[PDB]
Amino acid sequence: LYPDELNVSNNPHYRPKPVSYDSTLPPDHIKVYSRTLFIGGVPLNMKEWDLANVLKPFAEVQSVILNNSRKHAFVKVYSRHEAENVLQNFNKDGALPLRTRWGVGFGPRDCCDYQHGYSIIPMHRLTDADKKWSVSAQWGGTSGQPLVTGIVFEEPDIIVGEGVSSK
């Protein structure tokens, strides 16, 4: 891929990819923190670039999927910290009609706690591509560490060509 698409220290979108292990998770389950925000009430005149720019003080945006007719978007930012920063501080005045909350970017929707923005996922409910992306993604994921019971990581990037998803 191109150098801008690589999570490396000379890239200005470089982010560390924290991985931890949680002994409370059930057997053959993993924990994944979302980096994806669901934004509803997107004005009709507002496009992908507008959403990216209005969020820039709080978080650098990686991708936007905007359904303009339905007036909502899914916005993936480069790190979990940045996503939490958005929910904590963005549009607290209600100056814009945008309502922001946790989205799911990875794994089945029914595994997600939408209040806290993470999923406890049984490994059998991941596809082969989900598992591959979890370990080999540029942003999020485990950075080569294999998936085992208890592992905790940030939402990994997924690649549209290369597999079906549990999402």
From Swiss-Prot:
Domain of life assignment:
Eukaryota
Subcellular compartments: Nucleus
Q: Where is the RRM domain?
A: 35-105
Role summary? Plays a role in sequence-specific regulation of nuclear pre-mRNA abundance.
Additional info? Present with 19600 molecules/cell in log phase SD medium.
Protein known as:
Protein NRD1
Gene this protein is translated from: NRD1
Within the intact protein, the region shown is 305 to 471 of 575
